[model samples]
Target: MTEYKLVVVGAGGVGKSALTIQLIQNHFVDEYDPTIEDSYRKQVVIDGETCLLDILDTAGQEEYSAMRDQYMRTGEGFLCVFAINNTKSFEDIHQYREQIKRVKDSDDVPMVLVGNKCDLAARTVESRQAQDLARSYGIPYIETSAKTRQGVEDAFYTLVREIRQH
Candidate 1:
């Protein structure tokens, strides 16, 4: 079994926890719970390969920024998530990218830019803009939705496969 640590980071209320739960339990939590903090872990098999995914879903608020760096240190790869419906979240990706570069410093580490909440395409912020920004960062991009389970699996698996191949 190959073990990998991945960080899922973005602004708060961008559905990080929701996506994590959907991926692991295949279910959605209708209500938002604020009591829990820190990180979550889960495992999944892809193409007969068992991957131990330590998903550090960091809080988007400023206070948790320190914790974000700690998690980033352990991560071999990153899934930089931003909600497709929120333009501010999309703008924050640059800050997130800078943080990752400062901590990791290695171009070898792979990053996947994720535009989450695809189920709400009616209120999309900037789908193409996100992709263009990701391209500028030299990272692959994908749009995902936890509500419909669309591209949720692909986001993680795609990063894992890319890392393996590299």
Candidate 2:
């Protein structure tokens, strides 16, 4: 079995915890109490390998503009999530990516560009734009919906595969 520590960071209310909760508990959560920090862990087989995944669903500098880089520094991989309907959230992923690279001091790190809430309408950011960003960074881009439970597994599994390979 391989263990991978993944930190999920994005603008608040972007469905970070939703996707994390859905992946680990196989359930959708509509109500949640505010907490300092929390995370979700799971064990599953991906690509014929048993893997351990921890998706950190918490307060990171990615959201806390004044905070530091420990969030990305400690993490082995990352899920840079954004609400599809929010264009500002879409733009924030770039700074997050830049910080992670600076903290880790590497050009290549395990990262996934996730556009969450794919089931909703009136999305401001185009999929093509996000795909272009991911392509330019040499990272994988995936769209997910915690409400419909679509592409959640693919996002996690894809991240795990990339981490293992990295």
Candidate 3:
């Protein structure tokens, strides 16, 4: 079986862990506790082929930014996440993408900018803005509701598939 490595980097409480838990275990975590570097591995069957999926869920704190360089360099692709209600986190994702490109030394590194927590209904960042950002970077942008399991699966699958094709 093929294996893909993905680094889930984003702002704290942006549903990064929740999204990963949902995709790998088919459930949601109710609470949040900041950790150094949480890792998860799963066998995902995409397109009817089983593959090992490795996720490095990075911490969202500013101090962790120093540690993110490792993730950027090791990850084959990235799922850059931001909560829809938090504009600052959303804006910070641009920097993450830049770091990926710089660390990987390639403009074509596979990526998917994800706006998680869509079920809140109190969205501050609009879809068009997110989509527009993706366009500027020339990558795919997807919205996912981690709590409700809406598009949460696709977000990871899309990025992993992008890496496989890349």
Give per-residue CA lDDT, model 2, range 1-166, as digits (tens). Answer: 5778888888778888888888888899888554346866788877777877876776633346444475677899899999999999999888888888898999999989999999999889999999999999999999999999999989988888888788
Q: What count of clashes does model 3 give?
A: 0
What candidate 1 gets wrong by more than 4 Å, as runs, is: none
For lDDT, the strongest prediction is 3
The 10-residue segment of model 2 with minimum total lDDT is: 59-68
Candidate order (TM-score): 3, 2, 1
For candidate 1, the lDDT comes to 0.80
TM-score of each: 0.90, 0.91, 0.96
Encode model 1's per-residue lDDT on 21-83: one tens digit a residue.
888789977687642355666767888987788776677778765666777888887888888
The total number of steric clashes, by the backbone 3 Å criterion, in model 1 comes to 0
Q: Scored by CA lDDT, what does every candidate get?
A: 0.80, 0.85, 0.88
User: How many clashing residue pairs, candidate 2?
Assistant: 0
Per-prediction backbone clash count: 0, 0, 0
